[PDB]
Amino acid sequence: DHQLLRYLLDK
């Protein structure tokens, strides 16, 4: 659901 937030956090 929050794919972009998860991406920015896990980058």
Add this chain to the structure above:
Amino acid sequence: MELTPDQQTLLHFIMDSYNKQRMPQEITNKILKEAFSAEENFLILTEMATNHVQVLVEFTKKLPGFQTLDHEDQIALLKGSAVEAMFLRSAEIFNKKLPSGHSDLLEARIRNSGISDEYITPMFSFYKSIGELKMTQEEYALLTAIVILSPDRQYIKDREAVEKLQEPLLDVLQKLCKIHQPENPQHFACLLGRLTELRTFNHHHAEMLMSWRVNDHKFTPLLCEIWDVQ
């Protein structure tokens, strides 16, 4: 009373991370430059808000211990604080000193943004209340970090893990209030009080945005994830 070496280190680390944000003058110069239409102001807001969320995720990631937290709790903290952090940053920008007459024009330009008058009144009430506290750059930085690391957010599994991270930041802020404003011993309580008023902008945020006098309410995919829009 005075900051310990570990507290001075934490403060400088938070400050350095906090200063990565877009400069207040960049924002106010744009709004003061030309009088924009409701349609142009909506797009200025979405671009400003997208930059803010991007910088806020970078600031959040640097908060000591944040990367050790449960991944689902990390998302919950970000989603729970994004809107409050945006209004706290807007209050900082609004209360920055400008040449005589400019803050009057900035107020008027924000009143004519395109949103309903019912949402404007509480924003200025919060900005003027923040302004009377005469907060330093360090107070805004620590208060933003305290807002992000709020253990009382919905959908948080491990509240104690979040509490353990917020505690040293609350301790540093309390010392700074005693040093910057020794005349006002209620200063720290007042700052924690503003944090409770900040939370009021959450519930009706999507309603405020959809009340914008525009034909199409187009938000960026990142804003759709963090706000309750589209």
